[PDB]
Every structure is written in C-alpha cells, then in structure tokens.
From a paper:
The protease plays a crucial role in viral replication by cleaving the polyprotein into individual nonstructural proteins. HuNoV proteases are cysteine proteases structurally similar to picornavirus 3C-like proteases with a chymotrypsin-like fold. Their active site features a catalytic triad with histidine-30 (H30) as the catalytic base, cysteine-139 (C139) as the catalytic nucleophile, and glutamic acid-54 (E54) as an acidic residue which orients and stabilizes the conformation of H30 (15). The substrate binding pockets S1 to S4 in the HuNoV protease, which accommodates the P1 to P4 residues of the substrate, are in the cavity between the BII-CII loop (beta strands BII and CII, residue 102–117) and the DII, EII, and FII beta strands of the second beta-barrel.
Author numbering:
A (entry chain B): 0 to 33, 39 to 101, 116 to 122, 136 to 161, 165 to 172
B (entry chain A): 0 to 34, 39 to 123, 132 to 172
The structure:
Amino acid sequence: MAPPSIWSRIVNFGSGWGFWVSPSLFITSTHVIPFFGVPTKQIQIHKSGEFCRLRFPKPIRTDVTGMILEEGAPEGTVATLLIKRPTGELMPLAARMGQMGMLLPGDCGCPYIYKRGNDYVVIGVHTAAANTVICATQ
Amino acid sequence: MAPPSIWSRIVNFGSGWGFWVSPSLFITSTHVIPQFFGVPTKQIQIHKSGEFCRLRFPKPIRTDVTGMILEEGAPEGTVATLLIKRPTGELMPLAARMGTHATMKIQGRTVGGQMGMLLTLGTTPGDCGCPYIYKRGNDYVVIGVHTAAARGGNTVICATQ
C-alpha cells in the first residue's frame, strides 16, 4: 500500500531509524540520536519531547518530494507504523490510533503514515511499545 | 517499477550490495565481498562464476521473503530493470537493454558478463551487487547482478550464471 519511494525515506539513524519529510527535513526520536556528512553544528536540532526535527542548510534527499507532516491523526485514523529492521525486512503494521495506537528493540524513530486523498501524511515517529504502541508528536 | 518486497531483498554487502533471491540464496558480486550476516565464512556454500557470487546458507536467514526465479541472463533485446540503491537511501530503477556476452577492461580488471545498456543519471562502482530484474507475466525474474560499468558510456555488465 505504501510505495517504494516512501519506504526509501526511512533511513537508519544512530541506534534506530528516522524519516525524510523533504530533501532537507529529517525526523526521528530522541533516544536514537547518538550527521549525514553535515557538521553537527551546521544543523537545526529542535527536540520536542522524544521527537526531534533536523533541518540541513542544503538538500540531501533531492529525490524526495515535500510530504505533509501533521502533529497527529484524528481519533480513529488507521495509521500505518512503517518499521524497518536491520535484516532489510519491511514490517508494515496497522495502528488504530493520534498519539497512542492499537495494533491490529531499536525500532524507535520509524514514522507513522496515513493516506488522506491522493497524498500521504506523516504524524510522528515510533517512541516505545510493549499490542500497545506510542507515536511521538511534533 | 517494482514492489517494496523486491526492493527489500537488496541489502548492503561490503563495498556494495547483494540480493536475497530466496531465504537462503544470496547473489552478489565477487569483488564487493568484505575482507557474513553472522555466519562463519566456512559454513557458507560459496560458488563463483566470474564476478558472480552465489551464497547458499545452511539456515534460512531471510524468512520474510519468498523464493524467486533466478536465470542465466536474458535473451538479447530484453529490457531489464537494474534496481539501484544508493547509500543515501534513494532508489534508482534504471532500464537496461540487455545485449550479448562480452569481456572488457575497467579499473585494471578484466570483467565478463552479459552486456546491457542504460536507456533514457548513471551508475557508480558503489552500486555493484544490485539486481537486474524483468517481469515475466506475474513472476519477477532475476537475471544477474551489476558488476562493472564503462568509464563514460552507458554500457553496463551483468554478472550471470
């Protein structure tokens, strides 16, 4: 259901994963932050509570289109937790959810997506789980 | 292009990449082999046919994937898709018109494989190990692995067998 281009946005970072919103915007969780060739000082790091945004002065992923990132998902939205594993396996997981989710480590940082019209929407990143799941917000 | 499950079979293997044809079969390029997947190099059944390296492991490692048809190249004129992954994460499916088998010198190294040509950015040595794939009905089919590329040309070599 999620095309390869959106999977390619998910890239391993630190101890887990992160996600490309644009050629220059990259989101992840704070527990995986130990950058991509760019000095750690030439980046905007705006941590926001187990959620972190990284903005580079130059595009890094020019292959990637600008995708909408919202705070969360309206209650009842069936988001999709796109977990990647070190072996290369892709693990899509249907989550009912806007901040806490019900399914139907090193995974933290993987994004939450839900399709609205002919365009995808990011709503946060994987924070922790132990059927329960949690999604970090802006 | 191709679905995610096919792309997820492509993984970094040393200097370049490799391809999980089945849960236990792993094709790659002999030159990208590091100097595997948490397995003793002795325990792995290695086979080589030029710059083509086929690794059959004793235990199914990649249980998420399925078996896929692996063939010795493709007939002349077939348009295969070289599935390139770059270390930045980007995906680059490139169409290639497979030609005949040839032998050439590149980087002080005599290379052999099924020549192909990229059709309307370009390949890099870090891209070796990635698969040439063309769909035959419903079945996706692997024909070999990227092993070399001409200095300036769009000629490309596909390790076969």
